[PDB]
Amino acid sequence: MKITVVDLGNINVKYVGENKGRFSSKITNDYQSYEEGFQRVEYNGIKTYIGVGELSREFNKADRDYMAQLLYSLAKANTADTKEINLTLLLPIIQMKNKTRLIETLKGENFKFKFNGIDREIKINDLMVLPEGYASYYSLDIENKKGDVCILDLGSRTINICVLENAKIVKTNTIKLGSFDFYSKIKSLENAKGEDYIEEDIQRLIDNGLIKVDSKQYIEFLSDILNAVKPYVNLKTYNTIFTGGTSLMLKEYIEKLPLNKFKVHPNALTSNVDGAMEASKKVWN
Amino acid sequence: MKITVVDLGNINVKYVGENKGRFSSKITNDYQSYEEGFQRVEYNGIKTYIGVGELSREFNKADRDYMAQLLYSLAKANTADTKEINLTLLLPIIQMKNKTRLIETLKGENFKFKFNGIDREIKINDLMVLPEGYASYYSLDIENKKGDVCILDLGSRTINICVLENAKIVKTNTIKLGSFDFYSKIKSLENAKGEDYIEEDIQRLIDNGLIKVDSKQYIEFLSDILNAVKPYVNLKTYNTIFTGGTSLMLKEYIEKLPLNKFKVHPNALTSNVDGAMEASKKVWN
Amino acid sequence: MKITVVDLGNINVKYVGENKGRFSSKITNDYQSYEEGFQRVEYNGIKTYIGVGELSREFNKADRDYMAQLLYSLAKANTADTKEINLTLLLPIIQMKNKTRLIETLKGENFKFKFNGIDREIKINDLMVLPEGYASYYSLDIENKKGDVCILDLGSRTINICVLENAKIVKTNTIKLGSFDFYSKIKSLENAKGEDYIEEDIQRLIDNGLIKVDSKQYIEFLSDILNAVKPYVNLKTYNTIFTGGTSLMLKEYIEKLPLNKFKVHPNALTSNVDGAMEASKKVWN
Amino acid sequence: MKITVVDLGNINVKYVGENKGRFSSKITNDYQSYEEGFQRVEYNGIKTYIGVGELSREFNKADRDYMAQLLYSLAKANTADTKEINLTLLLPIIQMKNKTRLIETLKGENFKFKFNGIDREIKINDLMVLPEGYASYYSLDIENKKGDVCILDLGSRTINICVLENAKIVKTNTIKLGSFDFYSKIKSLENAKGEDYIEEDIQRLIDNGLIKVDSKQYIEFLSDILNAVKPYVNLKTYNTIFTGGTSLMLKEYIEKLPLNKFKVHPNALTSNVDGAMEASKKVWN
Amino acid sequence: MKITVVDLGNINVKYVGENKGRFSSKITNDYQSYEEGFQRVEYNGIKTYIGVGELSREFNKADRDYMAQLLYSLAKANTADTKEINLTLLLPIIQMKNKTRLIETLKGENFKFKFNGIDREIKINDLMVLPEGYASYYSLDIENKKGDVCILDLGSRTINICVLENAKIVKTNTIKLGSFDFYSKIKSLENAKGEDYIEEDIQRLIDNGLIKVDSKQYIEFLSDILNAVKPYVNLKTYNTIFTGGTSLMLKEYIEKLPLNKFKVHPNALTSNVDGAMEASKKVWN
Numbered sequence A, B, C, D, E: 001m002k003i004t005v006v007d008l009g010n011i012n013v014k015y016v017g018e019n020k021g022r023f024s025s026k027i028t029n030d031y032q033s034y035e036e037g038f039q040r041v042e043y044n045g046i047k048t049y050i051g052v053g054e055l056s057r058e059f060n061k062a063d064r065d066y067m068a069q070l071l072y073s074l075a076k077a078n079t080a081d082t083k084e085i086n087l088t089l090l091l092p093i094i095q096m097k098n099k100t101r102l103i104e105t106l107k108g109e110n111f112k113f114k115f116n117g118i119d120r121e122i123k124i125n126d127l128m129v130l131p132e133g134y135a136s137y138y139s140l141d142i143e144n145k146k147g148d149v150c151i152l153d154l155g156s157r158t159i160n161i162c163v164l165e166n167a168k169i170v171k172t173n174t175i176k177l178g179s180f181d182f183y184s185k186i187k188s189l190e191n192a193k194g195e196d197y198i199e200e201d202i203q204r205l206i207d208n209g210l211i212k213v214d215s216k217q218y219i220e221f222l223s224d225i226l227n228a229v230k231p232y233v234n235l236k237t238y239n240t241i242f243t244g245g246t247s248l249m250l251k252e253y254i255e256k257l258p259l260n261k262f263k264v265h266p267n268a269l270t271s272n273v274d275g276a277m278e279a280s281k282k283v284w285n
């Protein structure tokens, strides 16, 4: 019956199933006093509280206590009393160097937890994993897949690039770059003011406008990434579909690019799962 | 029907219900001669007289004979012949490590007393507890909750800090510091004069002016607390709402701070209960 | 209509009503020959003669045949043909451990007597009792009650201490010490001369100067009492109002004290009743 | 040469030196007629008679005319013609807030008296003070000090608690509770019979059996104290050595407790001084 | 002249200088009555008592009142009248994110204190800081540094890992894991018995044997940590030198491991400072 996609993302984690949505990738298993005021889950001796704590730009998100979080995300797309579901997962392209163990450490198994006191264990019917960013391919319609295209997922730490022909990949790339390197470059001198701010809290302070950043620096980042991608791809060729949340940093300037064929996908951040679902049906149905 | 908040505070206890107000947290069950000249209550073998005696900076205010006092406070916000009320209580953030027992030692139970000869037992409809200092959150209007803020309760022994985003907490802290450590630092040398005075009676002697204290020492305390809070919070960020009575020590200098967005809440001392009441309705109504 | 205060004092008893004054607390129901030359009253089989006899420093002045005396005192403040009056009484702080019975043994009752042949019984409208020494509080004006003060009744056997804030008590104490312990300490060696004199007749012999006492011994007593009171009160704080007759032993040296704010109340001996009357009106009016 | 411990206790005072023993803590300097029939001592204008009078549950036993008594106790452990001895004293844990003055008001000084006409002044070689209740520690043998223990002095007004590891303290506590609060709770209704009896004379009437008390009320007191001590100590841990005279109220039920390791020390009342003596040697020898 | 290493450790703090040793990291500036019975120091308004109180697993040990403690530790390795010494300090690897301020808040400065009344201020000649755990490197002899090795400091909250080639680091890691997570996992169900015990007091109760723990659970913890470390290091490679006190939890099973080359360093707990001293000489000499 039931199908689910959980995408682990860069800044957020992502659930779609009986319910849809996402939430922050931040994790705390560090100090904890007010159990009742925070989302919480305990499993196999790991007690974690969801959407707050430490994130520290680390690799191995698929091994460092994300389990709880992942389970939580599945509970988000699922009901509070679920026991069996079929699983589509995703990981960024490069990180797939860790697929195997994960799969057999999860495949068709049941896992416990305490979350918020609901405290139930859930079995999974089957796991099938896709490259994060790539799955947007299937969300594409033949309106552009009939021609060569470029799935271009601007994630906050990353840019994942899938250069595709009609009904097939042509090339792939991924460079750990994105809005964080911009935040850090901006902080290299804005924090040198004598101010205590970081790339982690920066986006909030621009959201409220307590501090602001020049647009031409956004343009500098755009130019840098364009220069980086030139050797592999001719962006004018391979009509480019921008996905991920970092595309929403810059849609305003991306639309201003001199390129011939491109577009920031509506709900660009969530498009990849939208295609991962075409794939999900193609397996289960 | 009826709702009540009793906040146990640092120096005072706090009642709001059929009646509103507060009174000193001082307790005597030590010598007692003139029963008629003091507020008095006896319950379960504990005879206590209200607003005078020993306070001694002790933890466990929620276990050391405060019962009588607490009951008294409820009688203050209530009529003299009450028998059933619904209870919202509060405790400082850290002290919640003692919630559980208290709740089930009180939940939906009836308790006796002798107070001043009125000598009635009263049932409670339900208890629901909030972190003291945090509840000011709800007293906030969207005029500032729409932006990230910092509930900053300067209590006499404590500073409780709740760093909040729009409609949610971001971080929390609490350091047992306040006007008492200032009194003690001042007494470390002013009492070294060869004078018999203490942090307990000091505030009275400055109220009458029998002895006075330099303002720059208030500024030293302000600088010390600001240095203490720096690692967690950027005070310029998270527009700071000062609450509690110790904020009334220093409003005159707090307004002089170089911060961008801040304010000493009107009735800052009582704001936390004012929000605890938004919460009270959100449960009962 | 009518109000009366009878204060039982240490050495004297005290009447104010239709008439004002006081007289010695000495009692004789021991030998009696010349009925006509002494004040006399018989009631309920107790025949007593007023202002002479035995006093012997005994407690329970409110149970040992003072009745006659008390009645006499009421007759002093009253007319010789009185039948109904409203009663304010007073007892020293500690002695209130005996209030209850007295009250209901007197409340709203009529009592007979023979005094000097006038031999009438009188009803009392109501009794209301105050701590002797404390009532001086009400005789105070806002000129000093606006600040923290100390009602300090030096009675001959006692020092009663009421430490007050604005419009309320802060602490209380009472130590059975006074000019008698000075007389006894002086007699411990002056009577050791081989001389037949006692603390009872001593004050007369210094009044006529037949024997005299060094002032520095008065100062020794002052220093001793000051050392005794130190743990409870900072005399420089709580502006001290001296009351009672033993304050008139030492006014000359009390004015010489190094204290910041103090005063021997004019008519210090009678001030306590002067305030007991503010209280009397506050009940009856 | 000579060593002495005088322990001031709750109900009794305690002397060990050239002689050993104890006697009641009751004091009278109030009326006195038959000098010859009572133990008596006069010093510095204070005339007192030993083991009878007023006790009134008051703090400051180390300032309120105990001097005479204390001297008497030293005379008890000493000969009738002593002039120089070395002093170990003790006070309850909390009361040590008064150490300093006492020490320098006594240290290496000579003090007079009249006692019973022996009327000699005695010098003291040195004072060294220990927490009453704690000194039982040293009376312990390595048979249990090798393991963590709990010196548990049940004094009549108090329970003093010293939680110790091997050769060191771990925690301490003291709550003014004991057999008096039981007497008062029992009197709250047994005296409400319409009977004239008090906690002061109660123990005698149960000693002669003129009135008796249910054992289950002893058990109620035991349960109350056990509930009180739970937050600090796990009684099963820290093998508990009961000391003081109130432990002799209940040894019969203490032995019935479900605890794993505990014992009422033989001569439990006097054990603390027995250890204070190990300490005494460790100073003098 | 003089050199000192103070290592702040996980459970203890560590001093070597004119004197050597360590003591508990526990801190109390909370209630304090018996000043004389506890180690004590006051500096800049902070009064602290050493080796007892609150520890609460908190970060920022290098900012939360450890100053006093740190000073105390220096006094431990130093004489009681020291005024100038050269400083080598250490902090855990991760915590170095706080180096800078500490250094310049201490570098070449003089600091006061009251400790136990010795109450002297001491200057420091220079500070130089090393990663705790890493310094064991220098304590190594060429007998194993000639080959690739792994400094493996099992601290109670932590495992610090320094993977080294000949005369140089190859990689580093640190995971906040250790005997505490074992205590907490054991308490998750052993305290669920209905028993009042915690990870803080657990080790004592196993030291005295009042409660005991299965060895296979130690083996479970060992297996968990080994699984955790696999991605970074091949333990068979990089001959592993176990250091810290948590290595002394398990030496008995560590020796049983199937590894080819490893050893629990003699005085494993103190080895890191032993190498920090090779470094100390390499600076000063």
Ligand SMILES: Nc1nc2c(ncn2[C@@H]2O[C@H](COP(=O)(O)OP(=O)(O)OP(=O)(O)O)[C@@H](O)[C@H]2O)c(=O)[nH]1
Pocket: A008, A009, A010, A011, A012, A013, A014, A025, A154, A155, A156, A157, A179, A203, A244, A245, A246, A247, A248, A249, A269
């Ligand atoms: N301006 C704007 N930025 C957004 C929005 N949603 C997400 N983002 C940005 O997305 C960035 C986070 O990384 P992403 O670009 O989303 O990369 P990702 O792999 O999709 O990571 P996930 O968000 O977890 O799916 C942050 O810089 C966000 O500010 C949005 O609605 N508006």
Ligand SMILES: Nc1nc2c(ncn2[C@@H]2O[C@H](COP(=O)(O)OP(=O)(O)OP(=O)(O)O)[C@@H](O)[C@H]2O)c(=O)[nH]1
Pocket: B008, B009, B010, B011, B012, B013, B014, B025, B154, B155, B156, B157, B179, B203, B244, B245, B246, B247, B248, B249, B269
């Ligand atoms: N100057 C001034 N200080 C006040 C006033 N009201 C309360 N305070 C101060 O408040 C301090 C007591 O602790 P609080 O700051 O009130 O902390 P709290 O947790 O709110 O404790 P509670 O007063 O019981 O609610 C004392 O130092 C008081 O002087 C006021 O109206 N004026």
Ligand SMILES: Nc1nc2c(ncn2[C@@H]2O[C@H](COP(=O)(O)OP(=O)(O)OP(=O)(O)O)[C@@H](O)[C@H]2O)c(=O)[nH]1
Pocket: C008, C009, C010, C011, C012, C013, C014, C025, C154, C155, C156, C157, C179, C203, C244, C245, C246, C247, C248, C249, C269
């Ligand atoms: N020198 C002097 N002493 C007075 C005078 N009036 C009363 N006394 C003293 O008062 C002492 C008696 O005890 P009080 O001090 O009056 O104590 P009290 O509780 O007020 O007792 P009462 O006199 O009955 O009201 C005696 O030592 C008197 O000498 C006075 O006018 N001059």
Ligand SMILES: Nc1nc2c(ncn2[C@@H]2O[C@H](COP(=O)(O)OP(=O)(O)OP(=O)(O)O)[C@@H](O)[C@H]2O)c(=O)[nH]1
Pocket: D008, D009, D010, D011, D012, D013, D014, D025, D154, D155, D156, D157, D179, D203, D244, D245, D246, D247, D248, D249, D269
């Ligand atoms: N049943 C019984 N009770 C005793 C005995 N000796 C002392 N007590 C009790 O001890 C209580 C008095 O207080 P304690 O428990 O002795 O406390 P303390 O601090 O040791 O006071 P001291 O007796 O002066 O040393 C009273 O309730 C006595 O009844 C005894 O031999 N038998």
Ligand SMILES: Nc1nc2c(ncn2[C@@H]2O[C@H](COP(=O)(O)OP(=O)(O)OP(=O)(O)O)[C@@H](O)[C@H]2O)c(=O)[nH]1
Pocket: E008, E009, E010, E011, E012, E013, E014, E025, E154, E155, E156, E157, E179, E203, E244, E245, E246, E247, E248, E249, E269
């Ligand atoms: N069994 C045993 N354990 C020890 C010994 N010494 C220290 N420990 C353990 O060490 C642990 C505390 O943390 P450590 O492993 O020492 O970590 P650390 O960073 O070295 O902290 P410090 O002890 O302060 O140096 C506790 O679990 C102790 O039981 C010992 O001699 N025997």
